[PDB]
Design an enzyme around this catalytic site. Structure first.
Site, mmCIF file in Angstrom:
data_model
loop_
_atom_site.group_PDB
_atom_site.id
_atom_site.type_symbol
_atom_site.label_atom_id
_atom_site.label_comp_id
_atom_site.label_asym_id
_atom_site.label_seq_id
_atom_site.Cartn_x
_atom_site.Cartn_y
_atom_site.Cartn_z
ATOM 1 N N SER B 107 78.368 35.946 83.422
ATOM 2 C CA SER B 107 78.304 35.884 84.878
ATOM 3 C C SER B 107 79.723 35.701 85.391
ATOM 4 C CB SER B 107 77.391 34.753 85.334
ATOM 5 O OG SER B 107 76.986 34.937 86.677
ATOM 6 N N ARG B 109 80.665 35.166 88.332
ATOM 7 C CA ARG B 109 80.734 34.055 89.269
ATOM 8 C C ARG B 109 80.913 32.734 88.539
ATOM 9 N NH1 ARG B 109 75.879 37.277 91.748
ATOM 10 N NH2 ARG B 109 77.058 38.596 93.201
ATOM 11 N N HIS B 221 65.978 29.385 84.597
ATOM 12 C CA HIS B 221 66.162 30.656 83.913
ATOM 13 C C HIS B 221 66.152 30.513 82.400
ATOM 14 C CE1 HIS B 221 67.849 33.449 87.260
ATOM 15 N NE2 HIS B 221 66.988 32.586 87.764
ATOM 16 N N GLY B 222 65.803 29.344 81.880
ATOM 17 C CA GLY B 222 65.666 29.186 80.449
ATOM 18 C C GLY B 222 66.519 28.092 79.844
ATOM 19 N N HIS B 225 68.992 23.501 82.882
ATOM 20 C CA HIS B 225 69.275 23.005 84.221
ATOM 21 C C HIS B 225 68.410 23.744 85.227
ATOM 22 C CE1 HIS B 225 72.176 26.423 83.985
ATOM 23 N NE2 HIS B 225 71.809 26.589 85.241
ATOM 24 N N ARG B 227 67.356 25.331 89.027
ATOM 25 C CA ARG B 227 67.970 26.094 90.099
ATOM 26 C C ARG B 227 67.094 26.003 91.335
ATOM 27 N NH1 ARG B 227 72.137 29.655 88.824
ATOM 28 N NH2 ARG B 227 71.340 29.589 86.672
#
EC number: 3.6.4.-
Lengths: 313, 313, 313, 313, 313, 313
Positions: B107, B109, B221-222, B225, B227
């Site tokens: 990513s 970002r 997302h797995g 943490h 989101r």
């Protein structure tokens, strides 16, 4: 906050009274004057610019060492004074009403918002000359009508039902008397037509006041419209509705608190206002505003989940 | 989104490989080149500015007639490439790992936010030289650790418990690859220490994710943490976690979906991910994401009222 | 256009000559001087700022009533003079070569573009100290090499083959001597390596010089690179290549016109230059530049259609 | 793109219908409304600002989370709506035509360009009051005339013959609905007088469409004028002319495709449109758009060379 | 105008004296002080910023109610004081010379122009450390040399002969003490080498002082250089050279008026200065400055016509 | 420079001709047109914007690749064309005069300066409607009067006698056709009343043309006023007065060169013009312009000294 005298003065026209505004330069000449304590209540005469409000209204205008007055040096002051005078000139006043028509309390923000409404070439106060008179008379206090959508204060429509209308009050970008706190957010809900509301519509309103504005309590100051204000403020509002109710032993207005629909008002505020209306003292009333309780305070259960699921798809 | 090859190229240093970034002017000279379909996969050689990425990465850079690439002409591209190279130079690569270490998906970002973290003279990635290496290796994908607070992506702390930390992702004011939608808001919750969380702390987290951010769903997302993303997006996220899970039949990563604490995840997303993990097809999984239900979806009942009453006083 | 003397002067260092630039304030003091016609050819001595070029170079600098000089008051003049001096100091000069090394004609735009090339931290003239010397010696005229891509003038690469390179000359945004016509567009094609070009590559070049730049003719001024200039200018170029060829009866340079590949040059310019090389007078040569003809002037027929069809899909 | 209802609403004037525009503030109040699925097709009534378009036109206006609508908050929206109303008020409508006159599809860019044409004090739509009516009726769709030069859309004349006129469409600097792609260039050729064109004039047109705009294909969308658009777009245009032709099984317009002069149209587009007109399916039609061919596709051979030679001198 | 004490103060270093500048903030603290008439002549001690000039120099600095002082609050004041101190530290002073070395009169404009000369990286005061010392000592008054071109004040060279140099005094764009009259123009001619000038050079000078600057008279204040100043000022200059000559009965300087070449000086000024030098009173001297006369006041007749005819061609 | 046709076109009004200006957008449409060599001399018809000047006036307007035309796209072009038309409409034209009234040569700078004169609310062309007509007819060429002060071109009065008036031509700050040389300075002297001038007045004029403007020669182009222009230009003026005189073998104007007062004109120009008037060839005339001579070329000797002495006091 300010009285009606700060904006206009009466001039006897041999049948009834006319009303004429002030000049900002005539007020500025009064803040510097030196009058003795026999002439504080009589209008001032600044030789060059005309009449000026009485000297007892010193601490009502934004001087150098003052900030709790209004910005009289602005182009909005003149517009608001012209509005007030145009309203009061229609309503014929008598020789025994002048002292009780310039001593009323008005919200300067309400009047400024009316001014902003009447200059929008696509409003209806811009075309209809009688609706503007009705709105201004409601704002002043010389009318027996209820503020509905068509004569409401104004702002920015953020929700419109078939029976309600939510406005967002733009009090930060005012000029005559803006809000100084840079964290001010407040809404108001006004009814479209004075008539019994259905039940499918109250649900569409409460399903929006719970999803979008959940950090905001729904209160009312007595008249026929709701005010949406955040919880960290509901204290100061209670200490401000109780004063006005208690300051109405001076019978010039019959304090008729119109407790609105209980399915919308915050239950704590409904309890507090019902108590204060029944005639209980302050400290026993505000006791009902801080008491924690969850007995049946959800008439329409299963609303936010519907909004979640309608948002997903 | 982009691969690791778009940022650096390997140069054999007779023991192992070194890694060197690119020049933006060497990429610009490649977008204009004319190579035949035998040399698309070999690095380009722009005589004046050096090596350039292979021509098959044409549609990965912001040309004139393109907007789904990255702004390689920016000062941030060089910083991110230097970061990637400094990470990969520590980790010694072998002659049979280069093709599988520059083909990973990262990513951009995340890397840009790490860059922003390491240049804050009051961070800890600015002092500790090993924490920055750990963070960058976690971001790249050559590490077996979990992203905790001390090596997290970054942003702006909007809530800090004794066990959690909420960050607000500033993806709109990026330069290398900002979010183009001007209505983007998203948060993430990272754990402070990898260890069992208590019960008094999960309550302080959920009592804040229900009062402040109530229009936001909690997904994952797995990895380790949470989101926080708004409901009107939970659809597109589901179609993006299912692809990656399904695109992991290519065994280079073992898809170990770490379903986090069920008392925090949105129950619909928990059901959908549990199904997708058990091995059910797509259309029967997304069926569990749109199904309306309210059977015991409130572990800690009586939370928002406590916050109201604590806000009043 | 200007000579090498306008930028530097020789100072005898008791073994060979050193070369030192000028000061703009020393030139400004010379344009105002009053010297007699015995000392026009000897360097001027402005007591305060040092040596200044001889007075015969009056009309070579941008005075108040002049615009065909160079902007010597700019920071670029000093850089170009330092470049010239650093080149000439390497090449050892002898007591019988100074008068023939400061009397050569150079293109100031070429030197300014070399300066711009050497300050790009991602060029190769910025690292390689010998390539810059080779480039500058080629530009000056004291070298027997051909300008290839790696020592080319510079600009902006708009096309790069495996054997050619197209540059776009940025002569409008110069400072030392910019082009004043605001409709100037010009390109140049330089070879990557001095060696026989294949046939699949000449086709990729001509298939781009016919589709994109079809309003531009391909000419050459004698050296080993092509120049792409629009047709409405091919007249003035012919009157400028014929002068230089005719002005080479002064044998200090052997005029060896390198007629490049006939499959690329405009056939009219190929005919004109072949004639002028065989030793024909002007008016019979320019006759071949305006003669209409279409006998076999398309070696690679069926090229633009291929580009159309490749563009559609 | 948008329908005629998005700009005006009918108001019955007891003989025939009048047409009145909308207010942007009345539309803004509709995007926030909450109407049930019985009243989506009836006009909305925002109490303060008047009538507003039906709620089913939600996703036709530029909201916060939308960009495929039009900038209704602009001063151009009001001008375009006034234009549409002034046109429709002349043409008397009947009680059985209103539903079929506000449901037509118009090009908002065409209307905005007409607005720009009528405010140029040196146009002829600025003087002639009937030509503006004819132009607007042609743009709306309630006329049986062909768009010639004198009632064309507008733009900037880049070529004018004795029989044709080329306009350059300025769609990037619009306000109501500009083109978002910053690489948009497009022209159109309109006939001066509806009459058979000579042969010396078609040659002067094709000798300019081959020299200047050689990277542009000449197509037509059915009506009586050519459109010059670059090849990398000829695909998307084909998929847009075939839809409209296929979407004309709804017989409210007789699809009469006017295949223009074959000596000007791109031969591939001529073949594709002739096929689609004869009644062949899509995939067999677009097969004729990508097929490479050079059998006699140059009627006027020996044109570009003439232009070269006329440019040299 | 100002004395040397306004810029520096002596500090006894047990062998000879050192000299140290002032602080602008130490002067500002002195203008506000209250000292009695016993301590006006002793240096002031502003506790916070150090020593300050004596209080008797009150009206020498630009206060609020003053404009005939110098802008001591500027960055130029510090540079000029550092220059003065660096000069006086070289020249060793004795315990009986301090009172006569800080009481001299200097031209602040001269010192500021020297400062401007020494910071030009292409001057010669920027390289030669001894020429700057000579120039500064000449400006101060502790040297017995004549101001030639190489140690001149400075400005902008507008003419340079083989024996003379004309400078244009830029007194309007100064900072420490600029000229307030916005119509000030003045030049000065300094000799290149102190030696007898030829005759072909005086003619080249006078042929330029008659054609270009014909509205300017050539005068001299006594030292070895000419001053070119317009006629409408020659009065005030005469009343300023006579004062200094008359104010030299205080023998600290021997008034040796160096009447320069009579073929260049204005004949009236030559007569006036010769008279004043022979010892005649004022009113009989200025009588020779206003007397009209044309007996042989053109040594080189036939000069302007030559310039006309050389300008035509 | 330009003819009268570039500004207006004749339209036959069945008794005599009317005159109508052009549109800049009609000219812009003509520069792009394609007309054949039969219709170059007939007015153009740009369908959208009206009539346009004939195509043979191509290179008279500032195109992209042109700078020797006029800025027709400016607001000044319309004013100048309206001025010309208002003048020509008064003067009745006949069917056999149109071809000889739009073919005259005029100075566009003269017309622009008249425009600037007529819009000054304190001029006299702003009040008197007949003086403006006289001035414009003099400028056009259809009048037999002499340009005196009251109908002069204009500018800025820098000297006014009892018989003369000096104007400073502001040709650099024009818009329709400014002077591009940034070193342009020029004056003109016009007579106040057409009558014999005295002798005390010619002396006051020459005593100012010798003191202030001594670097300027006094010439005349034939009409009744002097022009003050610097010597370095007197060459180009001579080659421009001789052309016009020689180009008057076309008898439409009788070349009556009015040699003005010899005591004011430069003697060389007086000799040259007298020769050219007597009928001598060019090269023998310009011989008298470069010949050096000083025989009695000072009628009023002892003038500059008087001015010096009057300036001193």
């Amino acid at each position: 906050m300010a009285e009606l005298a700060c904006f206009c003065y009466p001039h006897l026209e041999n049948d009834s009274y006319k009303f004429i505004p002030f000049n900002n330069l005539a007020i500025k000449a009064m803040l510097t004057a030196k009058v003795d304590k026999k002439d504080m209540d009589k209008f001032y005469d600044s030789i060059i610019y005309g009449i000026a409000p009485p000297p007892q209204f010193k601490k009502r205008y934004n001087t150098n060492d003052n900030s709790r007055g209004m910005n009289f040096e602005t182009i909005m002051f003149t517009k608001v004074a012209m509005l007030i005078c145009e309203a009061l000139n229609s309503l014929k006043v008598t020789q025994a009403n002048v002292s009780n028509v310039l001593s009323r309390v008005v919200s300067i923000r309400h009047l400024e918002n009316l001014v902003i409404r009447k200059e929008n070439p696509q409003d209806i106060l811009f075309h209809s000359k009688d609706l503007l008179l009705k709105s201004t008379l409601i704002a002043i206090g010389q009318s027996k009508e209820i503020e509905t959508t068509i004569t409401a204060e104004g702002g920015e429509i953020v929700f419109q039902n078939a029976a309600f209308t939510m406005w967002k009050l733009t009090y930060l970008e005012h000029q005559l008397m803006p809000i100084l706190d840079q964290n001010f957010i407040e809404y108001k809900v006004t009814l479209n037509e004075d008539k019994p509301i259905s039940d499918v519509h109250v649900k569409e309103l409460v399903a929006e006041l719970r999803w979008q504005y959940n950090k905001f309590a729904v209160i009312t100051h007595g008249k026929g419209h709701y005010r949406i204000v955040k919880y960290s403020s509901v204290a100061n509002h209670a200490d401000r509705v109780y004063a006005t109710f208690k300051s109405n032993v001076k019978t010039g207005v019959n304090n008729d608190f119109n407790l609105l629909d209980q399915r919308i008002i915050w239950q704590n505020w409904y309890a507090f206002t019902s108590s204060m209306k029944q005639g209980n003292t302050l400290d026993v009333c505000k006791r009902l505003l801080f008491q924690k309780m969850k007995p049946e305070k959800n008439p329409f259960k299963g609303l936010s989940t519907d909004r979640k699921m309608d948002e997903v798809s």
